[PDB]
């Protein structure tokens, strides 16, 4: 084994000078005994164009919990680099059940593991879908990320990426039914953005009665929406730890129902 | 008619461009508001 | 049953009073009225003048024979006109509602048995018009039929051929075809009317279950499914059954499960016309196209009320709850207009009186727009590890209590399948159900032997003694690995379980201490105090609640350790030696999905587990089989195209043979398959066999047979168009020229051990043909009785494949260890190398062969052969005067043998290449 | 090349497992010869579940299904193990 390691160290320059598929096989044989240079093997595969092999090697390295990076590379940084490589090579890398490369499942696993950048992960998935040409999949991913963002920065980044993609699509189309549907969905998202922001704020801190009052003001003349927002604020906000203006919330609820024109209820 | 149809298509394209510009301005304002809200958070 | 029908029954008395009213003075002989004798007397006497009672009795006898696995298609195929008349009478009785519900259920069961017996020519001919294109002619919308004809040119050609046949037919044949189509339509309408009538009894529920099973069987058979799925989609049978009060009853769990199975079979991801299995991407694309068409129809029809519905995404409208408010916003008239614009039957016939309201239309639209997972997703969602709910399921209890009186919602294996993935999923479901039933039976036996009860302080104790179960404390989790890439569940969750074997017997202690790695065990939390609530008169307890078992979690024991936490290096020395402590520790990997579900739902099953149940080594291999079945179902390509076409039961069944495959071998070296030329001539009758050389004398073994096809000389005859009607196509057998070639076998050395083994068995011509078919590429089936030399023919075919194709790999599959040992002995008797022969199996099995074919035995044989070869190489180097120790290592022996022999062999070949060198030189 | 013996006594899933033991190469399987030697008149595989054996037809084998479908099979007509009386008693079904 020690002589095999010495022979591998001696033939590493020979494998580097040989290049190509022979060097890929030599690197695989070396990683069969010494897999510490798997990052160098992935770099050589990227230099040779083996995106699927590099993705499989990264998945195998992430599956092993005892794997330590030689260059002190973080697991989150490696996952972000793999996501960026998948987004930049969404058409070059073949995705299917035969190769075992599931971009959506891996993105969901990364968002569940890293919920701080889950909105950024959804934005990256939307960018990968845009690079793959699936505009409907990118729009659905953006909608799911907007509806599942508990972070203000991640939601803002996802909304900015979706707005940039929609603006690029509108500029490309202007210079039929699908574009109109995308524009209507973007208009509905812009209309419900205050509601989504209020929901995200209530998820972060439901105790903000001032935020609930701002949401009720943003509801406007829709009386059923206004009534259900007060009932949700009643059921959600604990008065023992509320931080907004709960007494003013009951006050303008009373004002709204008085201007409605009834007294008893 | 091929002349009035072209004028109607041009008017529809101008209305779509104005709507796209208004949507872009609203998206910029919403992005600024979201950045302010993120800074507040 | 047969004995009940043999007795003095009402049907037998009616048949005696009606058909046995002859005035002949028969002798008073006490002859038993056997079912076979009655069937023989009624079948020859069956005719067009027979009453409906005789047809009902024949249908009941056929159903009893099918339930008892007795063939009845040959007796009906003896008289084809009588069988056709009986089938027409049965179809008329099934279409007629004047008969009782039991008679209708019996007729439906007979029709389902006939459909499952479609391999018979008479049954296939009778069921051909029922699943023909006449069902598409009876569609609700003619525009949908026109679009279906325009989409598939083959469907349009079939419809045109059916229309031409109906127009060219007489009154009788056209009336029969219209009667069959109207009988199918009236059966669907009567099923809908019975479902929507309400106040259904047990007979009505049984008839509905039989109809659901018949629909599932029709959807299973693809040639019938290609029209049955379209008919069910046009008639909206699923929305009618969902809104039916019979399926809404709490007691109709089996009916609901059968309806779910029929819906899954109807919504299978496979092409109805082409027969190609659709992937998840194809189903997603079809759902997206349907959603886009619905959005376009909404934008062109009701864009004011359904602006949000037509402006949303595919994922925001595929949910029934998401689309519920959009449908509630629209009115009933708008929904009816949308259904009419989508070629959906929003109105039924007045005879069926099917209620078509706004709720029914909303349910139909929700079912049509619902996204359904593929069969691969359903197979992946199924858990291989059984649980407490999976073992004590209502479907498993119904299958355990099943006796053939009622249908079951389980997959059925037949001659034809919708897809290879569908068949793999059906086999996986059947294996999982069998494993769950076996695990439930083992757990019930262990709980009965343990006899759990409530001790002092409320602690659940065990009164009886069970050998396969042991009381244990709460296990402690040792480690939890991180989740894998793309997998929510963890990679591994290893825990430690403490067991005691002081009170156990020495055999039980030895069996527990010698547990194999990754052995399937169940950690069971059981409390028998709640069974006292069953004594209180509360709710009806289940089998697990009556037995006291509360929860069960599967796990795989990987290693067994002593009381000090050290692994036992020598198990034989530990068993023979005196153990200092009787307490042992076992490391077990828990189910990752079950542990994740328990942690997410905050379930402390591991902190309450009070028993551990093991099983036998042979009976605990269902988990790997289920995993392999799930992997095969999830695999896109599990077999070759020709093998999948042959296994699917579609197309020509002889297409996988060597005569139809394009990769047939022209010349095959039989070597020593034929003992002599006379044996080869007798084994190849009816075929012209001539020698390859010009010598007319017969040649012995070895022989190579080449099947050279004789070229037909196309003479320049005039194209006479007169003699073309009476000239039928003669079935002239293609006499393949069997060219026999003889070659001198190469010598393997002057030693007597170098002589190759030759076959000394004179094979029959059928055995020779089977060996020739097996040697040629393709699919071969050898039907051999006991004592027909099937093992010898298989060994000869394996030897021929090894000799002809050294680069090919042979995979022998056996069912018993004795058969594998006999095959190994036959291969050793033949010219098969022991180094290339290997056996796969458990290492504890005794090897009946003279040589050990296991991995350790093969390694030992290879080491002995290496030592012998090293000694021979050292002797050869000493004889040749080669300096050094050439027999030290195998690589050194090869290098020395090359560097010595290769120049020497080259010099010898150069000396022999000279024309002046004689035999002495 | 894969050759199976007593295919009627083995399940269809167990028979298809040996045909899919190797992964396909370039979208196609490497199997070329598939031989199945058995006797459809022999005993079927044992199934613990009565409903699975009868209603679900889990006891049906791949060789029996291929024989019922109409696949071309070679039938051996020579027996040399038992006595002529026992062979003739066993030749009634064949």
TrEMBL record, chain A:
Q: Which residues form the signal peptide?
A: none
* Annotated compartments: Nucleus
Domain called Pre-mRNA-splicing factor SYF1 central HAT repeats: residue spans: 39-237
State the family it belongs to: Belongs to the crooked-neck family.
As for what it does, the entry says: Involved in pre-mRNA splicing and cell cycle progression.
* Subunit structure as annotated in this protein's UniProt entry: Associated with the spliceosome.
Q: What is this protein called?
A: Pre-mRNA-splicing factor SYF1
Query: What broad taxonomic lineage does this protein's source fall under?
Result: Eukaryota, Fungi, Dikarya, Ascomycota, Pezizomycotina
From TrEMBL, chain B:
Compositionally biased residues, Polar residues:
1-8
> What subcellular compartments does it reside in?
Nucleus
Compositionally biased intervals (Low complexity): 12-25
Q: Which branch of life, at top level?
A: Eukaryota
Its biological purpose: Involved in pre-mRNA splicing.
The record's family statement is: Belongs to the SYF2 family.
The annotated subunit structure for this chain is: May be part of a spliceosome complex.
Q: What's the name of the protein? A: Pre-mRNA-splicing factor SYF2
| Organism expressing this protein natively | Chaetomium thermophilum (strain DSM 1495 / CBS 144.50 / IMI 039719)
Q: Which residues of the full protein are shown?
A: 69 to 109 of 326
UniProtKB/TrEMBL annotation, chain C:
Q: Which residues form the RNA helicase aquarius N-terminal domain?
A: 39-373
Give the quaternary structure.
Belongs to the 40S cdc5-associated complex (or cwf complex), a spliceosome sub-complex reminiscent of a late-stage spliceosome.
**What does the record list as GO biological process?**
mRNA cis splicing, via spliceosome
Tell whether Nucleotide-binding is among the UniProt keywords: yes
Residue ranges occupied by any RNA helicase aquarius insertion domain in the UniProt entry: 663-755
Respond yes or no to whether keyword tRNA processing is given for this record. Answer: no
State its role. Involved in mRNA splicing where it associates with cdc5 and the other cwf proteins as part of the spliceosome.
Q: Where is this region: Disordered?
A: 709-728
> Where does the UniProt entry say this protein principally localizes?
nucleus
- What GO annotations for molecular function exist for this entry? helicase activity; mRNA binding
Q: Per its UniProt entry, which superkingdom is the organism in?
A: Eukaryota
Source species taxonomy: Eukaryota, Fungi, Dikarya, Ascomycota, Pezizomycotina
Q: Where in the cell is it found?
A: Nucleus
Q: Where is the RNA helicase aquarius beta-barrel domain?
A: 452-615
* Keywords annotated in UniProt: ATP-binding, Helicase, Hydrolase, mRNA processing, mRNA splicing, Nucleotide-binding, Nucleus
> Which portion of the entire protein is included?
24 to 944 of 1416
**Family listed:** Belongs to the CWF11 family.
- GO cellular-component terms in the record? catalytic step 2 spliceosome; U2-type spliceosomal complex
Protein name as annotated? Pre-mRNA-splicing factor
Automatic annotation (TrEMBL), chain D:
Q: Where in the cell is it found?
A: Nucleus
Which family would the database say this protein is a member of?
Belongs to the CWF11 family.
Quaternary form? Belongs to the 40S cdc5-associated complex (or cwf complex), a spliceosome sub-complex reminiscent of a late-stage spliceosome.
* Chain's role: Involved in mRNA splicing where it associates with cdc5 and the other cwf proteins as part of the spliceosome.
- Identify this protein by name: Pre-mRNA-splicing factor
Q: Name the lineage.
A: Eukaryota, Fungi, Dikarya, Ascomycota, Pezizomycotina
Q: Which residues of the full protein are shown?
A: 1040 to 1133 of 1416
């Amino acid at each position: 084994i020690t002589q095999h390691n010495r022979i591998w160290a001696l033939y590493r320059p020979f494998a580097n000078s040989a290049e190509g598929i022979t060097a890929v096989k030599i690197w695989r044989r070396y990683m069969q005994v010494h897999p510490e240079d798997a990052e160098d093997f992935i770099e050589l595969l990227i230099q040779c164009g083996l995106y699927t092999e590099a993705v499989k090697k990264y998945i195998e390295i992430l599956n092993n919990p005892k794997f330590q990076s030689k260059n002190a590379k973080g697991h989150y940084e490696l996952w972000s680099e793999m996501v960026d490589l998948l987004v930049e090579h969404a058409v070059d890398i073949e995705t299917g059940h035969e190769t075992g490369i599931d971009v959506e499942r891996i993105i969901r696993s990364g968002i569940e593991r890293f919920s701080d950048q889950r909105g950024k992960l959804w934005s990256g998935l939307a960018t990968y879908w845009i690079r793959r040409g699936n505009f409907d999949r990118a729009r659905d991913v953006f909608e799911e990320g907007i509806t599942t963002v508990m972070t203000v920065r991640d939601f803002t980044m996802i909304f900015d990426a979706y707005v940039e993609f929609e603006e690029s699509v509108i500029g490309t189309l202007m210079e039929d039914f699908d574009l109109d549907i995308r524009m209507m969905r973007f208009e509905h998202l812009m209309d419900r953005r205050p509601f989504l922001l209020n929901d995200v704020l209530l998820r972060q801190n439901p105790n903000n009665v001032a935020e609930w009052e701002k949401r009720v003001a943003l509801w406007g003349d829709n009386k059923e929406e206004v009534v259900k927002t007060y009932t949700d604020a009643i059921a959600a906000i604990n008065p023992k730890k509320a931080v907004g203006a709960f007494h003013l919330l009951w006050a303008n609820y009373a004002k709204f129902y008085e201007k409605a024109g009834d007294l008893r209820t | 008619s091929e002349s009035s149809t072209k004028n109607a298509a041009l008017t529809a394209a101008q209305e779509r461009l104005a709507r796209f510009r208004a949507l872009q301005a609203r998206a910029k304002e919403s992005s600024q508001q979201n950045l302010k809200e993120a800074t507040k958070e | 049953t047969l004995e009940d029908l043999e007795g003095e029954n009402q049907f037998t008395n009616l048949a005696r009073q009606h058909w046995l009213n002859v005035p002949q003075q028969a002798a008073k002989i006490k002859v038993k009225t056997d079912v076979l004798k009655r069937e023989l007397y009624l079948w020859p006497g069956y005719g067009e003048d027979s009453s409906n009672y005789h047809v009902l009795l024949i249908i009941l006898i056929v159903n009893a024979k099918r339930r008892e696995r007795v063939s009845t298609w040959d007796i009906f195929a003896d008289r084809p006109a009588d069988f056709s008349d009986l089938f027409r009478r049965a179809l008329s009785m099934t279409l007629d509602s004047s008969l009782s519900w039991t008679i209708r259920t019996h007729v439906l069961l007979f029709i389902i048995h006939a459909f499952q017996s479609l391999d018979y020519a008479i049954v296939r001919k009778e069921c051909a018009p029922l699943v023909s294109i006449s069902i598409w002619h009876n569609l609700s919308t003619e525009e949908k039929r026109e679009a279906l004809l325009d989409s598939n040119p083959h469907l349009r050609k079939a419809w045109r051929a059916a229309t031409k046949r109906f127009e060219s037919a007489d009154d009788a044949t056209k009336a029969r075809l219209r009667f069959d189509r109207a009988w199918l339509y009236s059966l669907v309408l009567d099923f809908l009317t019975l479902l929507y009538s309400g106040n259904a009894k047990q007979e009505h529920v049984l008839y509905c279950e039989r109809f659901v099973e018949f629909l599932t069987d029709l959807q299973s058979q693809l040639p019938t499914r290609r029209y049955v799925n379209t008919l069910l989609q046009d008639l909206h049978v699923l929305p009618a059954l969902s809104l039916s009060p019979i399926y809404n009853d709490e007691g109709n769990g089996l009916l609901r499960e059968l309806c779910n199975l029929f819906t899954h079979y109807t919504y299978f991801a496979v092409d109805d016309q082409s027969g190609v299995q659709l992937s998840r991407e194809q189903a997603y694309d079809r759902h997206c196209a349907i959603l886009a068409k619905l959005q376009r129809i909404a934008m062109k029809h009701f864009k004011e009320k359904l602006t949000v519905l037509a402006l949303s995404n595919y994922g925001s409208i595929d949910k029934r709850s998401e689309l519920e408010p959009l449908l509630q916003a629209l009115t009933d008239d708008e929904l009816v207009q949308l259904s009419n614009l989508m070629n959906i039957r929003t109105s039924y016939p007045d005879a069926a009186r099917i209620p078509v309201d706004r709720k029914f239309i909303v349910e139909v639209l929700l079912t049509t727009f619902e996204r359904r997972k593929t069969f691969q997703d359903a197979a992946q969602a199924l858990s291989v590890l059984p649980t407490e709910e999976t073992l004590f399921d209502i479907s498993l209890k119904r299958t355990d209590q099943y006796d053939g009186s009622r249908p079951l919602a389980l997959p059925k294996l037949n001659l034809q399948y919708l897809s290879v993935g569908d068949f793999l999923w059906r086999s996986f479901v059947l294996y999982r159900c069998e494993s769950f039933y076996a695990i439930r039976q083992d757990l019930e036996d262990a709980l009965i032997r343990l006899k759990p009860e409530v001790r002092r302080g409320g602690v659940t104790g065990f009164a009886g003694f069970s050998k396969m179960a042991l009381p244990i404390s709460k296990p402690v989790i040792l480690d939890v690995m991180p989740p894998q890439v793309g997998d929510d569940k963890p990679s591994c969750v290893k825990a430690e379980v403490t067991i005691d074997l002081r009170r156990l017997t020495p055999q039980i202690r030895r069996d527990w201490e010698s547990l194999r790695p990754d052995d399937v065990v169940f950690l069971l939390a059981v409390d028998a105090s709640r069974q006292k609530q069953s004594a209180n008169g509360g709710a009806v307890l289940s089998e697990a609640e009556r037995l006291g078992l509360v929860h069960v979690r599967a796990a795989e024991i990987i290693q067994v350790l002593d009381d000090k936490g050290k692994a036992i290096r020598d198990p034989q020395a530990y068993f023979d030696g005196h153990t200092r402590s009787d307490i042992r520790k076992i490391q077990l990997r828990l189910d990752a999905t079950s542990y994740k579900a328990d942690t997410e739902a905050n379930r402390n099953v591991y902190e309450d587990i009070n028993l551990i149940v093991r099983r036998s080594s042979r009976e605990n291999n269902f988990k790997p089989v289920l995993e392999s079945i799930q992997d095969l179902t999830l695999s896109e390509v599990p077999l070759a195209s020709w093998l999948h076409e042959v296994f699917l039961g579609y197309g020509d069944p002889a297409g996988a043979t060597f005569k139809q495959l394009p990769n047939r071998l022209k010349k095959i070296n039989f070597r020593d398959t034929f003992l002599d030329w006379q044996h080869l001539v007798e084994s190849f009758p009816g075929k012209i066999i001539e020698p390859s050389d010009d010598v007319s004398s017969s040649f012995g073994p070895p022989y190579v047979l080449e099947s050279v096809e004789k070229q037909v000389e196309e003479h320049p005859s005039k194209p006479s168009k007169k003699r073309r009607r009476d000239v039928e196509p003669a079935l002239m057998s293609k006499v393949e020229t069997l060219k026999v070639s003889t070659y001198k076998p190469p010598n393997n050395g002057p030693y007597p051990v170098d002589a190759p083994k030759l076959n000394k068995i004179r094979f029959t011509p059928t055995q020779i043909d089977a060996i020739y078919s097996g040697t040629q590429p393709g699919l071969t089936i050898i039907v051999g009785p006991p004592g027909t030399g099937k093992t010898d023919v298989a060994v000869q075919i394996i030897s021929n494949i090894y000799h002809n194709f050294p680069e090919q790999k042979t995979l022998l599959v056996a069912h018993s260890n004795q058969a594998l040992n006999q095959l190994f002995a036959k291969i050793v008797a033949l010219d098969i190398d022991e180094r290339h022969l290997l056996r796969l199996g458990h290492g504890e099995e005794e090897l009946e062969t003279e040589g050990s074919f296991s991995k350790h035995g093969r390694v030992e044989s290879f080491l002995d052969n290496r030592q012998r070869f090293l000694y021979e190489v050292s002797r050869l180097a000493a004889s040749m005067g080669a300096p050094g120790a050439h027999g030290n290592s195998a690589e050194t022996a090869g290098y020395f043998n090359k560097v010595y022999v290769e120049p020497a062999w080259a010099k010898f070949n150069d000396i022999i290449q000279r024309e002046d060198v004689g035999p002495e030189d | 090349n894969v050759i199976m013996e007593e295919a009627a006594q083995i399940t269809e899933i167990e028979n298809f497992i040996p045909l899919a033991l190797q992964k396909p190469k370039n979208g196609q399987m490497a199997l070329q010869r598939v031989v199945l030697c058995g006797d459809h008149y022999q005993n079927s595989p044992v199934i613990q579940g009565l409903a699975f054996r009868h209603y679900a037809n889990l006891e049906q084998s791949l060789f029996s299904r291929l024989v019922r479908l109409g696949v071309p099979t070679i039938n051996l007509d020579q027996q040399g193990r038992a006595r002529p009386s026992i062979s003739n008693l066993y030749r009634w079904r064949y």
